[PDB]
Ligand binder design. Structure first.
Ligand SMILES: OCCSc1ccc(Cl)cn1
Ligand SMILES: OCCSc1ccc(Cl)cn1
Ligand SMILES: OCCSc1ccc(Cl)cn1
Ligand SMILES: OCCSc1ccc(Cl)cn1
Ligand SMILES: OCCSc1ccc(Cl)cn1
Ligand SMILES: OCCSc1ccc(Cl)cn1
Lengths: 541, 541
């Protein structure tokens, strides 16, 4: 009975195979068949290629030794370059997405997975491309065994015994996939299940049959998520009693993610790997009042003016002249204010669900809140302690009742005051939404054990303060790159609420997500990622 | 008696003044004198410019209103643009370095300092330039008061009363520097000491005379340092029992700083702001065994193979495909191994003092260590507990005896074993080196209270392990961008030790620091910064 799957890189996890190029070069250049491919394998275990594959020499040291082997094998053309051929071939090689999906599905079903590859130590000026591919691929597997690192090579039988030792599994427990029959033989000869990879589909039909797990024609997979303990955790003191926590991933332009109420940096779990993979440095915050960020008790510590001033200090301390700001719910409001009050520090601005609405100088904000029935819950949140007591009574119940898709809801946010609470017509043991696992609920539960709901609720307790500050920006317009993302089924932050935004943001770009509730990021992660990456690459460098 | 200094931005902290451009434009374009300058001030307190300066409207909203004012003031040329004129003017304006040096000196001598400026809300597509200038300038001052943020403007007398309130000082305690006589008058009229700024030198002679502090012809100042509590602190779990801590500042290509023994991320205090200012994202590590990074007790947890594997995981977890690695002492060795074993993850490599020396396969590493008298202290470090006991006995004594310039030393590193210890011929109360303050010593003391010297010393306790691993790279060459920085007076890591490096690193670049001891970074910070920034901008994007 199988419990581990082993994949080759070239021709299996990455396509087109680099061997396929040696052949294509001969054909395009009308060279004798296998002239280049025979030069590549000259001397066998004694040859330059084995030394390269074992890690004895680097790729740049091997280039002129291959140039010698192709000369002795052959006449060759005028400006023929081994460097150019390999550079083009490596650069053209991309991840074989359906093969990676199968490895992800097998790992999700309890398998130990590994990449076993004959590769080199790459010191070419263009080595980053490959470095990137390996970095992306490797994080999806339990083990990455590289010939040049272990000083062993396929087909030598010691690399297989090394493989079985790292896996801590007997050969009959292991499936091995390879495009080279010769490299497949010692695994077969040892009793491992083997699959010769030509076309991916046939290879996956063989893999499905042999494991008893559906891998082909599977429903669309969710984006890569975050394991909290595997992240880089960052901490910046913005003032004597205030430290802000953030999770950090990737390189490139800085992207600041700002969650809403009652959330976490973890609400961006499906966006963080996606955006880092797209070429951005992601800073997913724990907003003030939340998780590992400080939570002072004073109401005024949570007015937009101070929240924004602290986010500017956060940048100053990290040495960032700008960041793109992306917010959701209360974070979406903060992000529109960063754009209005600190445009020099905001590269671009994006909001999920939260529209930009100018302050009404002729109306009290609590009159304005009363005018919209769905904003009743915000009046229930005013009285210090009332909502803290209900929300803190049973954390698991709080998150399970809140975090539900549009077709699952147990909460109506109108007539909350009259009803006497948010969960008064809600079950004691709500069912688990399709959006979350029990473990994901338990992470929010553990986060909220530290400070609870006082700091988070205080964000709502500065209506008049925020309104007076906001009135200072009434003559301004938002003229920096801006994205507004609406969610069809957000029954509080309705798409219609964003209808007059181009009056204050004339060059505004838009995104819209159908059949999406309030919890945009975990409801429709795939689409959020597509809309954000697309707008980032076009409007935010 | 004075205790606070207030500086204007335009014409004082930043030059050339933007007003100087309105005049230069009229002259270059043969327009009537003051045509543009009068359009800029049309309507006075009622006009477009006051509304801009008060924050009522943004810079992009004001552009067409200024275009209207210049039309009514005047004929104008074919392709005349207010946007182009202001874009060029803002971009040409740079920090007035000697004025900033004077403000830094006054703050160092106990003054409260502040920037008081009539500025706008900048939403131009090119607003980052200005955002950057303000970000750099503001961090050197106690307060930054901007007209557009406070809704007040110079010369209105309320902005001065606002200024005195923020400062919590009576007017006679305040010096105010401004290039505009009209904006200077209300401060004078209130009893504040005032200086009319034309040329900087005269203004600084007036400032010196009035404060009694030397500001002109002062010796060269040290680079900007780091206050630990003002930084962004990052934490990444690289394995179940191992978390690595780092300090993070700036945006741009990632630069990983790796300290030596017995140090801290804080050993890079003079490099961190400098490199961030130069356009880099700095990650200053607490190396394994140090500060807030984990310190497991096992010797083998500190061999180069594991240290390097953990630094690759550090990148994987932060989502960085590459980083430039810069190391000093033991960090310099790690950085050469990152380059040899993981060239795809290293954008470029630089070492301070530590040369790259290939493993000798025909000689035991402890035979090799015995062959060099100055490496005696490394044999003293072998026996578990011996050096921990001496180094942990008095922390303040440990750091004060170690951290000394070449012309101050109390330690000879030969005959340490024979002598029975590192500090046996050293005073109980060493004097404080010119390189460090008492407070800087006390930071290292507090850091080492957590784990002590066991993890740090374990870096030396893997000679044979590191030698066997290193022998795997004997056929390789370092062919990625590489910098070797030698220190004239490092009496252990002598410049001569680097003499054969181009045999293994043919395209190696070099730096050399005269009259520099072992503690390169704090000994010669200005030169380290110059050599690193220069090599980074040329060789590491
Ligand atoms: O539950 C919070 C919805 S987002 C939001 C944003 C702004 C204001 Cl004033 C109120 N609510
Ligand atoms: O599950 C969706 C209803 S819960 C909810 C909470 C807050 C806002 Cl703004 C909207 N909906
Ligand atoms: O007083 C200015 C805040 S107005 C506002 C803006 C956004 C939302 Cl969701 C609710 N209210
Ligand atoms: O004090 C440490 C000097 S740096 C160093 C680097 C490598 C080796 Cl094997 C020994 N010392
Ligand atoms: O103060 C300078 C002598 S202390 C010292 C410590 C380590 C090394 Cl590698 C060199 N010098
Ligand atoms: O065994 C390989 C390490 S050789 C070496 C390299 C650098 C320094 Cl400072 C001392 N020894």
């Amino acid at each position: 009975t199988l419990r581990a799957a082993v994949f080759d890189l070239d021709g299996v996890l990455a396509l087109p195979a680099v061997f396929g190029v040696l052949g294509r070069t001969e054909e395009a250049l009308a060279l004798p068949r296998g002239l280049l491919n025979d030069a590549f394998q000259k001397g066998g275990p004694e040859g330059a290629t084995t030394r390269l594959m074992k890690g004895e020499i680097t790729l740049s040291q091997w280039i002129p030794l291959m140039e010698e082997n192709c000369r002795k094998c052959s006449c060759l053309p005028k400006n023929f370059s081994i460097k150019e051929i390999f550079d083009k071939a490596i650069s053209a090689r991309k991840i074989n997405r359906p093969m990676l999906q199968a490895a992800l599905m097998l790992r999700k079903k309890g398998f130990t997975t590994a990449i076993l590859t004959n590769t080199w130590l790459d010191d070419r000026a263009e080595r980053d491309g490959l470095a990137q591919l390996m970095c992306e691929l490797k994080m999806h597997f339990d083990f990455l065994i590289e010939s040049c690192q272990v000083g062993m090579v396929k087909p030598e039988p010691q690399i297989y015994k090394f493989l079985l030792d790292t896996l801590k599994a007997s050969p009959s427990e292991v499936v091995f996939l390879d495009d080279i029959g010769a490299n497949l033989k010692p695994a077969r000869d040892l009793g491992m299940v083997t699959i010769l990879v030509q076309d991916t589909d046939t290879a996956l039909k063989e893999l499905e049959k042999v494991t008893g797990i559906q891998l082909l024609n599977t429903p669309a997979p969710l984006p890569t998520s975050c394991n909290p303990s595997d992240m880089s955790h960052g901490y910046v003191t913005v003032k004597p009693r205030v430290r802000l926590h953030f999770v950090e991933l990737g390189s490139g332009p800085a992207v600041c993610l700002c969650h809403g109420f009652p959330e976490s940096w973890y609400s961006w779990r499906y966006q963080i790997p996606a955006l880092a993979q797209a070429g951005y440095r992601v800073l997913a915050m724990d907003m003030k009042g939340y998780g590992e960020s400080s939570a002072p008790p004073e109401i005024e510590e949570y007015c937009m003016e101070v929240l924004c001033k602290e986010m500017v200090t956060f940048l100053d301390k990290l040495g960032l002249s700008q960041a793109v700001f992306i917010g959701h719910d209360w974070g979406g409001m903060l992000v529109w204010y960063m754009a209005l009050f600190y445009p020099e520090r905001v590269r671009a601005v994006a909001s999920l669900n939260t529209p930009f609405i100018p302050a009404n100088p002729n109306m009290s904000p609590l009159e304005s809140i009363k005018a919209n029935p769905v904003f009743d819950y915000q009046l229930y949140f005013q009285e210090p302690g009332v909502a803290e007591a209900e929300l803190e009574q049973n954390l698991s119940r709080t998150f399970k009742s809140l975090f539900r898709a549009s077709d699952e809801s147990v909460l109506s946010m109108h007539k909350v005051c009259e009803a006497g609470g948010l969960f008064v017509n809600s079950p004691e043991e709500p069912s688990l939404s399709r959006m979350v696992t029990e473990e994901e609920i338990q992470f929010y539960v553990q986060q909220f054990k530290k400070s609870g709901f006082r700091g988070p609720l205080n964000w709502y307790r500065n209506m008049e303060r925020n309104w007076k500050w906001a009135c200072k920006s009434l003559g301004r317009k938002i003229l920096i790159p801006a994205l507004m993302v609406t969610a069809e089924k957000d029954f509080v932050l309705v798409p219609q609420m964003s209808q007059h935004m181009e009056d204050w943001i004339p060059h505004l770009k838009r995104g819209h997500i159908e059949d999406c509730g309030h919890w945009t990021q975990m409801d429709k992660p795939t689409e959020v990622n597509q809309i954000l990456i697309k707008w980032l690459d076009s409007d935010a460098r």
